[PDB]
Amino acid sequence: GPSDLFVHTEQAIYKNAHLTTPNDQTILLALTADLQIDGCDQPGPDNIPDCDCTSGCYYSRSLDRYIPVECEAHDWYPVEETQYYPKHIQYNLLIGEGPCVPGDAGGKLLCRHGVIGIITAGGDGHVAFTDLRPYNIKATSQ
Ligand SMILES: [Zn+2]
């Protein structure tokens, strides 16, 4: 079935700006990660954990189902200029070994606990994953 929907945590709706770019109501957004956060009274179970494992499972669109994969978390990696954004450096990226296609973007990667990041980047035999951990209500401050 259709699994293409945004994520709502408590009162923060996280989604891809390059796939949403809504009005100017978005509370805060980080162009560096092309992620936006809006407000709403539609709280969901979506609660990013405090750990971002490496070997998990992401929703593979090529097989229309979750598949086991292994990505390595990186404090920051270079993102070659593309249709999304120009050349720069991102933060919290999980690069692994998997197929990539124009649409697979958005695949949530569940680990020992659960979703730890979605597909934000993709390359040859390599798939990046935006770590949602370093953003949610894990601690903040400092
Ligand atoms: Zn974990």
PDB file of C-alpha atoms and ligand atoms in Angstrom:
ATOM      1  CA  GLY A   1       0.000   0.000   0.000  1.00  0.00           C
ATOM      2  CA  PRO A   2       0.851   3.724  -0.033  1.00  0.00           C
ATOM      3  CA  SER A   3       3.609   4.501   2.468  1.00  0.00           C
ATOM      4  CA  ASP A   4       4.421   8.023   1.284  1.00  0.00           C
ATOM      5  CA  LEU A   5       3.502  10.299   4.191  1.00  0.00           C
ATOM      6  CA  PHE A   6       5.217  12.898   6.375  1.00  0.00           C
ATOM      7  CA  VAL A   7       6.110  12.387  10.038  1.00  0.00           C
ATOM      8  CA  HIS A   8       4.405  14.109  12.970  1.00  0.00           C
ATOM      9  CA  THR A   9       6.069  14.029  16.390  1.00  0.00           C
ATOM     10  CA  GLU A  10       3.946  15.496  19.183  1.00  0.00           C
ATOM     11  CA  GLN A  11       3.510  18.861  17.463  1.00  0.00           C
ATOM     12  CA  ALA A  12       6.417  18.926  15.011  1.00  0.00           C
ATOM     13  CA  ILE A  13       5.872  17.730  11.442  1.00  0.00           C
ATOM     14  CA  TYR A  14       9.183  16.679   9.895  1.00  0.00           C
ATOM     15  CA  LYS A  15       9.333  16.354   6.109  1.00  0.00           C
ATOM     16  CA  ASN A  16      11.536  16.980   3.070  1.00  0.00           C
ATOM     17  CA  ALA A  17      11.446  20.604   1.921  1.00  0.00           C
ATOM     18  CA  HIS A  18      12.359  19.525  -1.611  1.00  0.00           C
ATOM     19  CA  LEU A  19       9.222  17.373  -1.533  1.00  0.00           C
ATOM     20  CA  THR A  20       6.981  19.786   0.368  1.00  0.00           C
ATOM     21  CA  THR A  21       8.172  23.397   0.256  1.00  0.00           C
ATOM     22  CA  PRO A  22       4.853  24.503   1.806  1.00  0.00           C
ATOM     23  CA  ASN A  23       3.813  28.045   2.724  1.00  0.00           C
ATOM     24  CA  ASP A  24       5.809  30.285   5.062  1.00  0.00           C
ATOM     25  CA  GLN A  25       4.191  28.733   8.135  1.00  0.00           C
ATOM     26  CA  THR A  26       7.050  26.312   8.787  1.00  0.00           C
ATOM     27  CA  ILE A  27       8.333  27.131  12.271  1.00  0.00           C
ATOM     28  CA  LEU A  28      11.960  26.200  11.604  1.00  0.00           C
ATOM     29  CA  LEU A  29      13.850  24.490   8.779  1.00  0.00           C
ATOM     30  CA  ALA A  30      17.444  23.512   8.013  1.00  0.00           C
ATOM     31  CA  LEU A  31      18.329  23.941   4.338  1.00  0.00           C
ATOM     32  CA  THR A  32      21.524  22.054   5.172  1.00  0.00           C
ATOM     33  CA  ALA A  33      19.367  18.944   5.535  1.00  0.00           C
ATOM     34  CA  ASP A  34      16.441  20.076   3.383  1.00  0.00           C
ATOM     35  CA  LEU A  35      14.241  19.297   6.387  1.00  0.00           C
ATOM     36  CA  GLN A  36      11.320  21.404   7.609  1.00  0.00           C
ATOM     37  CA  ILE A  37       9.312  21.445  10.839  1.00  0.00           C
ATOM     38  CA  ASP A  38       5.738  22.732  11.010  1.00  0.00           C
ATOM     39  CA  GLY A  39       3.133  22.825  13.764  1.00  0.00           C
ATOM     40  CA  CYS A  40      -0.070  20.830  14.173  1.00  0.00           C
ATOM     41  CA  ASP A  41      -2.376  19.240  16.747  1.00  0.00           C
ATOM     42  CA  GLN A  42      -1.974  15.816  15.141  1.00  0.00           C
ATOM     43  CA  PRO A  43       0.486  13.980  17.428  1.00  0.00           C
ATOM     44  CA  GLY A  44       1.736  10.569  16.341  1.00  0.00           C
ATOM     45  CA  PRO A  45       3.652   7.570  17.729  1.00  0.00           C
ATOM     46  CA  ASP A  46       6.640   8.622  15.626  1.00  0.00           C
ATOM     47  CA  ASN A  47       9.259   9.116  18.341  1.00  0.00           C
ATOM     48  CA  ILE A  48      12.884   9.011  17.197  1.00  0.00           C
ATOM     49  CA  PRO A  49      15.061   7.014  19.629  1.00  0.00           C
ATOM     50  CA  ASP A  50      18.311   8.138  21.253  1.00  0.00           C
ATOM     51  CA  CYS A  51      20.506   5.656  19.383  1.00  0.00           C
ATOM     52  CA  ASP A  52      21.322   5.346  15.681  1.00  0.00           C
ATOM     53  CA  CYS A  53      22.540   1.810  14.991  1.00  0.00           C
ATOM     54  CA  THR A  54      24.233   0.853  11.721  1.00  0.00           C
ATOM     55  CA  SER A  55      22.672  -2.468  10.724  1.00  0.00           C
ATOM     56  CA  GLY A  56      18.930  -1.976  10.358  1.00  0.00           C
ATOM     57  CA  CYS A  57      16.154  -2.104   7.771  1.00  0.00           C
ATOM     58  CA  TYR A  58      14.780   0.508   5.372  1.00  0.00           C
ATOM     59  CA  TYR A  59      11.614   0.557   3.267  1.00  0.00           C
ATOM     60  CA  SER A  60      12.829  -0.554  -0.162  1.00  0.00           C
ATOM     61  CA  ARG A  61      10.600   0.846  -2.907  1.00  0.00           C
ATOM     62  CA  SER A  62      12.237  -1.470  -5.444  1.00  0.00           C
ATOM     63  CA  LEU A  63      10.804  -4.423  -3.521  1.00  0.00           C
ATOM     64  CA  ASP A  64       7.889  -2.597  -1.897  1.00  0.00           C
ATOM     65  CA  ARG A  65       8.954  -3.736   1.572  1.00  0.00           C
ATOM     66  CA  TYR A  66      11.489  -3.243   4.364  1.00  0.00           C
ATOM     67  CA  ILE A  67      14.924  -4.708   3.650  1.00  0.00           C
ATOM     68  CA  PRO A  68      17.934  -5.333   5.928  1.00  0.00           C
ATOM     69  CA  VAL A  69      20.777  -2.872   5.356  1.00  0.00           C
ATOM     70  CA  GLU A  70      23.916  -1.569   7.061  1.00  0.00           C
ATOM     71  CA  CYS A  71      24.868   2.113   7.112  1.00  0.00           C
ATOM     72  CA  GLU A  72      27.672   3.926   8.935  1.00  0.00           C
ATOM     73  CA  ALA A  73      26.820   7.103  10.844  1.00  0.00           C
ATOM     74  CA  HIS A  74      29.006  10.081   9.936  1.00  0.00           C
ATOM     75  CA  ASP A  75      29.240  13.343  11.880  1.00  0.00           C
ATOM     76  CA  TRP A  76      29.343  15.029   8.472  1.00  0.00           C
ATOM     77  CA  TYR A  77      29.933  14.139   4.822  1.00  0.00           C
ATOM     78  CA  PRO A  78      30.405  16.071   1.553  1.00  0.00           C
ATOM     79  CA  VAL A  79      27.313  16.288  -0.653  1.00  0.00           C
ATOM     80  CA  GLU A  80      28.128  16.863  -4.323  1.00  0.00           C
ATOM     81  CA  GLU A  81      25.933  19.539  -5.900  1.00  0.00           C
ATOM     82  CA  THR A  82      22.741  17.982  -7.261  1.00  0.00           C
ATOM     83  CA  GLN A  83      19.122  18.722  -8.166  1.00  0.00           C
ATOM     84  CA  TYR A  84      18.533  19.011  -4.419  1.00  0.00           C
ATOM     85  CA  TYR A  85      21.294  21.294  -3.148  1.00  0.00           C
ATOM     86  CA  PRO A  86      24.746  22.542  -4.231  1.00  0.00           C
ATOM     87  CA  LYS A  87      28.112  21.295  -2.972  1.00  0.00           C
ATOM     88  CA  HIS A  88      28.376  21.430   0.822  1.00  0.00           C
ATOM     89  CA  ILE A  89      28.701  19.415   4.030  1.00  0.00           C
ATOM     90  CA  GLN A  90      25.795  17.746   5.828  1.00  0.00           C
ATOM     91  CA  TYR A  91      25.477  16.383   9.364  1.00  0.00           C
ATOM     92  CA  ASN A  92      24.398  13.015  10.762  1.00  0.00           C
ATOM     93  CA  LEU A  93      24.515  10.899   7.603  1.00  0.00           C
ATOM     94  CA  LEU A  94      24.300   7.102   7.511  1.00  0.00           C
ATOM     95  CA  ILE A  95      25.941   5.787   4.343  1.00  0.00           C
ATOM     96  CA  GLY A  96      25.440   2.110   3.565  1.00  0.00           C
ATOM     97  CA  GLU A  97      25.357  -0.342   0.667  1.00  0.00           C
ATOM     98  CA  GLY A  98      22.046  -0.326  -1.183  1.00  0.00           C
ATOM     99  CA  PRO A  99      20.311   0.515  -4.480  1.00  0.00           C
ATOM    100  CA  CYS A 100      19.102   4.024  -5.314  1.00  0.00           C
ATOM    101  CA  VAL A 101      16.256   5.340  -7.467  1.00  0.00           C
ATOM    102  CA  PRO A 102      14.308   8.552  -8.191  1.00  0.00           C
ATOM    103  CA  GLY A 103      11.583   8.026  -5.607  1.00  0.00           C
ATOM    104  CA  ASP A 104      13.049   5.758  -2.939  1.00  0.00           C
ATOM    105  CA  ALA A 105      13.803   8.928  -0.976  1.00  0.00           C
ATOM    106  CA  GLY A 106      11.924   8.899   2.317  1.00  0.00           C
ATOM    107  CA  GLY A 107      12.601   5.302   3.281  1.00  0.00           C
ATOM    108  CA  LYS A 108      12.702   5.104   7.071  1.00  0.00           C
ATOM    109  CA  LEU A 109      15.461   2.934   8.536  1.00  0.00           C
ATOM    110  CA  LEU A 110      14.361   0.958  11.596  1.00  0.00           C
ATOM    111  CA  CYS A 111      16.972  -0.444  13.980  1.00  0.00           C
ATOM    112  CA  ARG A 112      17.061  -2.478  17.194  1.00  0.00           C
ATOM    113  CA  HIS A 113      14.675   0.131  18.601  1.00  0.00           C
ATOM    114  CA  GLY A 114      13.083   1.663  15.518  1.00  0.00           C
ATOM    115  CA  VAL A 115      13.333   4.384  12.882  1.00  0.00           C
ATOM    116  CA  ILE A 116      16.673   6.177  13.178  1.00  0.00           C
ATOM    117  CA  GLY A 117      16.749   8.029   9.871  1.00  0.00           C
ATOM    118  CA  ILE A 118      15.303   8.260   6.370  1.00  0.00           C
ATOM    119  CA  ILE A 119      16.849   8.297   2.896  1.00  0.00           C
ATOM    120  CA  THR A 120      18.297  11.755   2.262  1.00  0.00           C
ATOM    121  CA  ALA A 121      21.105  10.964  -0.176  1.00  0.00           C
ATOM    122  CA  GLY A 122      21.923   8.264  -2.709  1.00  0.00           C
ATOM    123  CA  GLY A 123      24.757   7.193  -4.978  1.00  0.00           C
ATOM    124  CA  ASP A 124      26.409   4.251  -6.720  1.00  0.00           C
ATOM    125  CA  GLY A 125      25.884   1.215  -4.510  1.00  0.00           C
ATOM    126  CA  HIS A 126      25.652   3.653  -1.608  1.00  0.00           C
ATOM    127  CA  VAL A 127      22.637   5.031   0.259  1.00  0.00           C
ATOM    128  CA  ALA A 128      22.761   7.853   2.803  1.00  0.00           C
ATOM    129  CA  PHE A 129      20.362   8.189   5.736  1.00  0.00           C
ATOM    130  CA  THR A 130      19.541  11.379   7.640  1.00  0.00           C
ATOM    131  CA  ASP A 131      19.925  10.614  11.346  1.00  0.00           C
ATOM    132  CA  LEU A 132      16.801  11.983  13.031  1.00  0.00           C
ATOM    133  CA  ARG A 133      18.263  11.157  16.443  1.00  0.00           C
ATOM    134  CA  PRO A 134      20.461  14.290  16.516  1.00  0.00           C
ATOM    135  CA  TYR A 135      17.466  16.631  16.417  1.00  0.00           C
ATOM    136  CA  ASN A 136      14.486  15.074  18.196  1.00  0.00           C
ATOM    137  CA  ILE A 137      13.889  15.371  21.941  1.00  0.00           C
ATOM    138  CA  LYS A 138      17.003  13.425  22.933  1.00  0.00           C
ATOM    139  CA  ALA A 139      18.505  16.086  25.198  1.00  0.00           C
ATOM    140  CA  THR A 140      19.011  19.423  23.445  1.00  0.00           C
ATOM    141  CA  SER A 141      20.710  22.394  25.104  1.00  0.00           C
ATOM    142  CA  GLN A 142      24.466  22.611  25.656  1.00  0.00           C
TER     143      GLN A 142
HETATM  144 ZN    ZN B   1      19.551   1.788  17.884  1.00  0.00          ZN
END
